[PDB]
Amino acid sequence: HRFMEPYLFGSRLGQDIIDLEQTAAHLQLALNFTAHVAYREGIILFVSRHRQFAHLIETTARDCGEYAHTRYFKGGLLTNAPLLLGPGVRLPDLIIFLHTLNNVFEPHVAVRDAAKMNIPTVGIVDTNCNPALITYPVPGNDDSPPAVRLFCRLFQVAISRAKEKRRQVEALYRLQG
Amino acid sequence: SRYGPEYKDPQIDKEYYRKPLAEQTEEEKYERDFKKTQLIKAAPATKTSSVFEDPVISKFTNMMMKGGNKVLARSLMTQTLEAVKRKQFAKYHAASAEEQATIERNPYTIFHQALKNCEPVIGLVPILKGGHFYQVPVPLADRRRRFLAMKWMIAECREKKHRRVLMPEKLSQELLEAFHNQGPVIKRKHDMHKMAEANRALAHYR
Amino acid sequence: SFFTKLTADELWKGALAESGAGARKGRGKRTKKKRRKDLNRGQIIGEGRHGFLWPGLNIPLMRNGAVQTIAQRSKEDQEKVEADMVQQREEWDRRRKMKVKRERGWSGNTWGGVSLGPPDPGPNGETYDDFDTRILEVRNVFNMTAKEGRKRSVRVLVAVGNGKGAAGFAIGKATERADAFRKAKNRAVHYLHYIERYEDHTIYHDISLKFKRTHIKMKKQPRGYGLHCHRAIMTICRLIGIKDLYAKVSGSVNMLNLTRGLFLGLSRQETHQQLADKKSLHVVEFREECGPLPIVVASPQGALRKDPEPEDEVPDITLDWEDVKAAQGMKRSVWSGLKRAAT
Amino acid sequence: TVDFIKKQIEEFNIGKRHLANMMGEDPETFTQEDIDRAIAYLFPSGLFEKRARPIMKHPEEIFPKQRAIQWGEDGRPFHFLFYTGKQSYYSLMHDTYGKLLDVEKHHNQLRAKDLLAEKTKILKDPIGSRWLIKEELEEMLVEKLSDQDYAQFIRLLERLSALPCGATEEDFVNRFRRSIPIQSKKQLIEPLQYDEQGMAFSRGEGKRKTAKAEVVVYGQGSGRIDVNGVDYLLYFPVTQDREQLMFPLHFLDRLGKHDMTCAVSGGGRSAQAGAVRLAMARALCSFVTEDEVEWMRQAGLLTADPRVRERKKPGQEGARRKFTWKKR
Amino acid sequence: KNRAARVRVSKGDKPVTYEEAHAPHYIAHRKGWLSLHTGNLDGEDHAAERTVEDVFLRKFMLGTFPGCLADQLVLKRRANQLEICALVLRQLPPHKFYFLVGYSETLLSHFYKCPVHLHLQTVPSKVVYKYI
RNA sequence: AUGUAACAC
RNA sequence: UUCGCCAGAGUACUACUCGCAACUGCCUAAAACUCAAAGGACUUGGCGGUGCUUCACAUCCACCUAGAGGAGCCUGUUCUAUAAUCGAUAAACCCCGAUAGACCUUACCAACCCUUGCCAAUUCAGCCUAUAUACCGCCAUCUUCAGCAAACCCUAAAAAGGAACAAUAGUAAGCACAAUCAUAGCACAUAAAAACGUUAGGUCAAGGUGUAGCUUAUGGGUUGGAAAGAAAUGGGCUACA
Ligand SMILES: [Mg+2]
Ligand SMILES: [Mg+2]
Ligand SMILES: [Mg+2]
Ligand SMILES: [Mg+2]
Ligand SMILES: [Mg+2]
Ligand SMILES: [Mg+2]
Ligand SMILES: [Mg+2]
Ligand SMILES: [Mg+2]
Ligand SMILES: [Mg+2]
Ligand SMILES: [Mg+2]
Ligand SMILES: [Mg+2]
Ligand SMILES: [Mg+2]
Ligand SMILES: [Mg+2]
Ligand SMILES: [Mg+2]
Ligand SMILES: [Mg+2]
Ligand SMILES: [Mg+2]
Ligand SMILES: [Mg+2]
Ligand SMILES: [Mg+2]
Ligand SMILES: [Mg+2]
Ligand SMILES: [Mg+2]
Ligand SMILES: [Mg+2]
Ligand SMILES: [Mg+2]
Ligand SMILES: [Mg+2]
Ligand SMILES: [Mg+2]
Ligand SMILES: [Mg+2]
Ligand SMILES: [Mg+2]
Ligand SMILES: [Mg+2]
Ligand SMILES: [Mg+2]
Ligand SMILES: [Mg+2]
Ligand SMILES: [Mg+2]
Ligand SMILES: [Mg+2]
Ligand SMILES: [Mg+2]
């Protein structure tokens, strides 16, 4: 994709090589933002429309205590929230896209819907993805199972560290007075 | 159609059931039949397991009937078979030994052989091509051939008989003429064959 | 003949003929006006033209602790009570024939420039009384269907604005005009812009653009001469809070295209703080009424560059022939210097 | 609407106590069929729709099962699939796929340890097993579904059930298993009746086209049939109708070994002959053994004839034929 | 189209009573009869007089309770006494309810020469079955 | 092959 | 950076000029007069003797049975005809209002009569007078077709459209279909049902009515009469054996 040339280190025999210096520089800020939004008691949604890891995203979110939509995203879900979900619904505060593309190789609907609804996101963008709408993109590989499992493990430990540190500083506030 | 699609036609023949143990596949067929818990229709009022009935006789009597008078059609068939039998007996009594050996007296086989020589082999259909209707010869189904034979018999003996000559003796005379292959229904079948060969060149339109 | 008569609902439904085939497609409104009046309004239930005074319906049960008898008023009291009833009837007629004055926005019959008040509150309990909404275009749009034939769908375009710099526009289409108004009001608060205003009255710099086939050129003005603009632009600038502007529109003067191009041009507006941050230099405003005094309006935060701008003897800028013709005084059109009404 | 449900439960209990009081029965043994006949006595609606009749039942059975509250007071959802739109169905698919993955992992471990201790229990055909209907699965999941989602869930269930089976996974699967009733078209053989030193006489009822026939048959006599006090030959001059009277006896080769007497009413000659034929067929089942009873069934004797004359329609002539339709 | 005793489908806002929400082919299927009397049986006489009495009762109650009458009456005939069952809104005072009850009782008793009962249930508003 | 001449949001 | 063109449409690749081996020719090229449009691209229906698939189950052909159109009679129309009703009058009129006309019905016609003239009252009754192109009430048709539609949301604008199940913007309360119910046991079949709309489809003559017309008459009563077939045609009954 034309927006991945600054994030590409180069091409190795026709294959794109992503600069992991830039990936780490993006990923530190992305993990820090996720940790802070989990610290401030926000709603965090994991989206990955890919049927090779979908159970693993869903179990990852079950162990995180945060929510996941790895199934079909209905059209007016983030946008027309009160008709789909319930009479008074608090919108998600952050979305992680592990895969910004769907099964027919189009950009994901929930990225555009979160841009409409002013919902910040962390997106793993490949060399064919769109990082324009993502406020916190990380240029990386979303196809290889070690990369996907490592991203899930880092988001797991980020969420767990954030919630446990929120609990300890809450206990410190309680013992202050 | 008060019967549902699950209902099937009953099997009436007694010899199909009375000797089952000599073959395997028809056995397996009927334990499938009564182990699928399948619904069977009621037996029709015309068909019966009697050995003195015969199905082409039943169909011919059904085509004999006008309106709803079954007993009148069966009476006409009864006097027709009686007239055929007694005409053949009168022909038997007036002949010599070789002709008595030649002559068949069974009206059932006379009727069957009359329809077997009476049914047409090929038929004609009208097909529209280029704004004109053309007669094209087609192979006919066996039920259609038998039907055309039956309909031609009833049509002739209803139309060109006289008012004084009775219907069963007239149809008996036409049965003997069709048995001896000199009948006007046989001539009509031959005329249909004439038109079929005259339209043989149109057979590629099908 | 008492069994022959019917119920008032059936009588009024047969009388007004609201379900007839004339009003269905649009065949009506040629000679059609039927008014429905509730005949059960001024009934005291026990009132009668003979004037019988009943102890439970008309007058109460007990007087001085005793039981009242069935009585009848005088004939004079009967024309008094009948006069009160009929004077109530022309009082209802006088209230009915009074029509509320419709405030005109741009013209007598059009809906352009008409305000509809504050927009409706949202589902979260948020209430917006500071915004005002105005209609810029009303247009009856027809559609061809298999059954009904012509299908009239009213579409309208509205703008909301609080006067503090926040404004937005939307379209709303429905079968009924009031439904389209409500849909446009509810959809306009979803789409909002913020328009930067230099000293809260005028825009930052001169903006010229071409959106599709509409050419919009807006010019910055000083404090004292206000809003020389097309009427839609005047309404939008009043809802934004812009009090001084010049606007000229060329080509198609389509309302939706003009509004979209205007909002794109005013959202692509570049502020002096952004200019000073992107150039790393001080920007100085030289007022003509203040003389040669160097008013500094913005300062570049961060590192200030010591290298001056390259001074080109002949600058390379795109000039407009209408603007140069206005500057050279060759614009002798009689419509340019016309004195007009208030803003 | 939970407090509404609790209010309905408590006033249903109070009304049950008043109903037991007003009938004068024991309130502890007072049960639901007692409630049904109680309401059917006290408020007797004769209405053709059975659901429009007055009812007072358990409010859980009457009121539809409701969705619970999906979030706390802070707005955070309780369940982690609330933002999919269908939390219960997708949690069910999640649990099924987790069980399938655990089965695959355990079976790979058993293959590595070289042990196959599981058995194929998918075939519950002698029980007559069927899966859930989409309506039943909607009722269980308290949410609307679709046919594609239902087919997806059933094929995932087949994928789980076609693998080696654990006890917990079989207990998970058997929640969604439903049992059919007994499928059988075998008739009930009427026992022979002995009365006043008479041996082996049987009784049969036949009905075909308004004609009702009682047929009582004795196995101890010669071959003759007495219809309505007169001989069968005098009563049925039609040879076809006498063939209808023949047909079961010639089918069972027992033409002369039975003495019959008959009572038929209504209809014409062929309707009476068909009714007598069906009644003899139903009466002969006692004498005749079971495989020949099934042979009778596929001969079509024992099945009643549903062909009944239709009603004349208004604007038509003879219930199919309409009037002469003129094009112009 | 069949148009007898049916309410037309509007935008979805009109309230409807159960009797008005069912088509006439639901009579004795889902909804019942508003009048019960002997004269419509097989070998029984005097149906037309009961019919015209039924009609005059409907118009008299409709005009006697103007606007506060909710819906159609229930007219029961049981051994020459005539029971008139009504749903009336809480509009008029109970003084006026009892005045009209005694008036209607005595007037119809002396007009049809038979004992009459007036049975009322008084409701806050029109009972809504569907739509709304 | 053809079917003219008074439809209104 | 240049060159040639473009000033509403028709008139008009035209009239009159210049030039040309062209003489029914080519190039250049207006005006009088008329109109408020002439135009380019799209959106949705409709339609197609346009193409490709799957079909028709009394429905088109192949094909089954019984009829009509030929005769007599009954009955309803169309035309003439009388002083002598009205409505329907393609499918969706034609033994249709009428499951019903010798007087009554009866609204028609000819003679006569009565004008607070059915009622508790009314400067009031009463009208089968006109408009079904004002209507309600009751229906026909598409139609045993499956769609209609309130309230939201999206489209680099939006005329409008809104689906891909290994799912790419659609949720959708509801009405129809379906399900249920009746033909006294299931099942099938029949009946019943069939939304929103189309035909300004039928009905001011079942009844009420808005509007427009009468009030010694377009109203209210009595008597007597309503013909007929030159002709054509629809549906039936009886036959032609
Ligand atoms: Mg990839
Ligand atoms: Mg004006
Ligand atoms: Mg018939
Ligand atoms: Mg012509
Ligand atoms: Mg010109
Ligand atoms: Mg040319
Ligand atoms: Mg020329
Ligand atoms: Mg010239
Ligand atoms: Mg047909
Ligand atoms: Mg005939
Ligand atoms: Mg004929
Ligand atoms: Mg004829
Ligand atoms: Mg005639
Ligand atoms: Mg006529
Ligand atoms: Mg008229
Ligand atoms: Mg006419
Ligand atoms: Mg028509
Ligand atoms: Mg008279
Ligand atoms: Mg008369
Ligand atoms: Mg008159
Ligand atoms: Mg009409
Ligand atoms: Mg008409
Ligand atoms: Mg549908
Ligand atoms: Mg749409
Ligand atoms: Mg809906
Ligand atoms: Mg039933
Ligand atoms: Mg059915
Ligand atoms: Mg029907
Ligand atoms: Mg149905
Ligand atoms: Mg008309
Ligand atoms: Mg009238
Ligand atoms: Mg007819």
User: How far is the C-alpha of C76 from the C-alpha of A95, rounded, in Å?
Assistant: 84
Q: Tokens for C52, please give them.
A: 């019988």
User: How far is the C-alpha of C23 from the C-alpha of C28, rounded, in Å?
Assistant: 5
Cα Dmax for chain E: 48
User: How far is the C-alpha of D14 from the C-alpha of D12, rounded, in Å?
Assistant: 5
In the three-class reduction of DSSP (H, G, I as helix; E, B as strand; rest coil), residue C217 is classed as strand
Q: Which residue has the tokens 């008709």?
A: A83
Distance of CA D328 to the CA centre of its chain: 52
Nearest Cα neighbor of D304 from D193, D206, D216 is: D206
The helix (H) or strand (E) run that includes residue C284 is strand C283-285
Contacts of A20 (CB under 8 A, 6+ apart): A140
CB contact under 8 A, A43 and D90: no
Between the CA of residue D191 and those of C106, D188, D200, D278, D304, what are the distances in Å? Answer: 100, 9, 10, 18, 21
User: How far is the C-alpha of C166 from the C-alpha of D147, rounded, in Å?
Assistant: 48
The helix (H) or strand (E) run that includes residue C62 is strand C62-63
User: How far is the C-alpha of B133 from the C-alpha of B156, rounded, in Å?
Assistant: 27
Q: Are A78 and A114 in contact (CB under 8 A)?
A: yes
User: How far is the C-alpha of C273 from the C-alpha of C279, rounded, in Å?
Assistant: 10
Backbone angles phi, psi at C225, to 5 degrees: -120, 120
**Residue E29 CA to ligand 26 centre (angstroms):** 13
Residue A36: count of CB within 10 angstroms of its CB: 13
The helix (H) or strand (E) run that includes residue B56 is helix B55-64
User: How far is the C-alpha of D54 from the C-alpha of C102, rounded, in Å?
Assistant: 57
Residue by residue, DSSP assigns C111-173 as -TT-B--SPPP-TTS----S-EEEEEEEEEEEEE-SSSSEEEEEEEEEEEE-SSSEEEEEEEE
User: How far is the C-alpha of C135 from the C-alpha of C155, rounded, in Å?
Assistant: 11
CA angle D217, D221, D227 (to 5 degrees): 45
Q: Tokens for A139, please give them.
A: 């240029």
Per DSSP, helices labelled H in chain A are 20-39, 54-64, 81-84, 109-116, 145-176
Q: Chain E contacts of D47, Cβ < 8 Å?
A: 28-30, 32
Residue A97: count of CB within 10 angstroms of its CB: 25
| Signed CA dihedral, C143, C146, C150, C156: sign only | negative
User: How far is the C-alpha of A98 from the C-alpha of A110, rounded, in Å?
Assistant: 12
Chain B, 34-73: which have a CB under 8 Å from a chain D CB? Answer: 34, 37-43, 45-46, 48-50, 53, 70-71
Q: Tokens for D26, please give them.
A: 């024991």
Between the CA of residue B20 and those of B23, B24, B25, D134, what are the distances in Å? Answer: 7, 8, 10, 45
User: How far is the C-alpha of D4 from the C-alpha of C339, rounded, in Å?
Assistant: 72
Q: Are A70 and A142 in contact (CB under 8 A)?
A: no
User: How far is the C-alpha of E63 from the C-alpha of E41, rounded, in Å?
Assistant: 31
Buried b (16+ CB within 10 A) or exposed e, B58-71: bebbeebeeeeebb
User: How far is the C-alpha of A47 from the C-alpha of A121, rounded, in Å?
Assistant: 10
User: How far is the C-alpha of D226 from the C-alpha of D228, rounded, in Å?
Assistant: 6
Q: Are C113 and C135 in contact (CB under 8 A)?
A: yes
User: How far is the C-alpha of D299 from the C-alpha of B179, rounded, in Å?
Assistant: 36
The helix (H) or strand (E) run that includes residue A44 is strand A44-48
CATH code at C120? 3.30.230.10
User: How far is the C-alpha of C163 from the C-alpha of E113, rounded, in Å?
Assistant: 78
Name the residue type at position C85: M
Name the residue type at position D29: T
How many CA atoms within 13 Å lie on the side-chain side of C130? 9
Flag whether A143 is marked binding: yes
The helix (H) or strand (E) run that includes residue C307 is none
Question: Nearest by CB to C57, which of E62, E67, E96?
Answer: E96
CB-count exposure of residue C87 (10 Å: 0-12, 13-18, 19+): exposed
Q: Tokens for A112, please give them.
A: 């555009």
Distance (Å) from the alpha carbon of D102 to chain E's nearest alpha carbon: 50
Q: Tokens for C37, please give them.
A: 């009046």
Q: Are D217 and D280 in contact (CB under 8 A)?
A: yes
Domain of residue C169, residue span: 114-194
Q: Are C217 and C230 in contact (CB under 8 A)?
A: no
Residue by residue, DSSP assigns A108-121 as PHHHHHHHHTT--E
In the three-class reduction of DSSP (H, G, I as helix; E, B as strand; rest coil), residue E58 is classed as helix
| Residues forming beta bridges with residue D206, ordered by sequence position | D213
Per DSSP, helices labelled H in D28-86 are 32-42, 59-62
Q: Chain D contacts of B49, Cβ < 8 Å?
A: 247, 250-251, 299
Ramachandran region of residue B192, left (φ > 0), alpha (ψ -120 to 50) or beta? alpha
How many CA atoms within 13 Å lie on the side-chain side of A72? 7
* Pairing status of strand C166-174 against strand C150-161: antiparallel
| Residues forming beta bridges with residue C72, ordered by sequence position | C52
Nearest Cα neighbor of C119 from C128, C110, C109 is: C128
Contacts of C129 (CB under 8 A, 6+ apart): C118
Q: Is the minimum CB–CB distance between E12 and chain C shorter than 8 Å? A: no
**Residue D321 CA to ligand 13 centre (angstroms):** 25
Q: Which residue has the tokens 């049914």?
A: B119
CA–C1' nearest nucleotide, residue A49: G167
Q: Please give the method by which this entry was determined.
A: cryo-EM
| Residues forming beta bridges with residue B127, ordered by sequence position | B134
Distance (Å) from the alpha carbon of A9 to chain C's nearest alpha carbon: 28
Buried b (16+ CB within 10 A) or exposed e, C213-245: ebbbbbbebeeeebbbbeebbbbbbbbbbbbbb
Q: Tokens for C63, please give them.
A: 């007087």
How many CA atoms within 13 Å lie on the side-chain side of D138? 10
Q: Are B84 and B76 in contact (CB under 8 A)?
A: no
User: How far is the C-alpha of B26 from the C-alpha of B16, rounded, in Å?
Assistant: 9
CA B2 / C1′ G189 distance in Å: 5
Alpha-carbon dihedral A32, A34, A37, A38, rounded to 10 degrees: -110
Quick one: DSSP state of residue C49? S
User: How far is the C-alpha of A65 from the C-alpha of A124, rounded, in Å?
Assistant: 21
Q: Which residue has the tokens 């046989």?
A: B186
Name the residue type at position D222: S
Name the residue type at position B157: C
Quick one: DSSP state of residue C248? E
Q: Which bases along strand F come within 7 Å of a protein CB atom?
A: 8-9
Q: Which residue has the tokens 């027709």?
A: B80
User: How far is the C-alpha of C253 from the C-alpha of C251, rounded, in Å?
Assistant: 6
Nearest Cα neighbor of A77 from A50, A43, A109, A121 is: A109
CA E86 / C1′ G123 distance in Å: 43
Residue D19: count of CB within 10 angstroms of its CB: 18
In the three-class reduction of DSSP (H, G, I as helix; E, B as strand; rest coil), residue A125 is classed as strand
Q: Is the minimum CB–CB distance between E96 and chain C shorter than 8 Å? A: yes
Residue list, CB under 5 A from ion ligand 2? C 108
Q: In what order do the strands lie in the sheet with A67-69?
A: A67-69, A44-48, A94-99, A121-125, A136-139
The helix (H) or strand (E) run that includes residue D217 is strand D211-218
Distance of CA D267 to the CA centre of its chain: 32
Name the residue type at position D109: Q
Q: Tokens for D191, please give them.
A: 């026992």
Q: Are D20 and D26 in contact (CB under 8 A)?
A: yes
Distance (Å) from the alpha carbon of A161 to chain D's nearest alpha carbon: 19
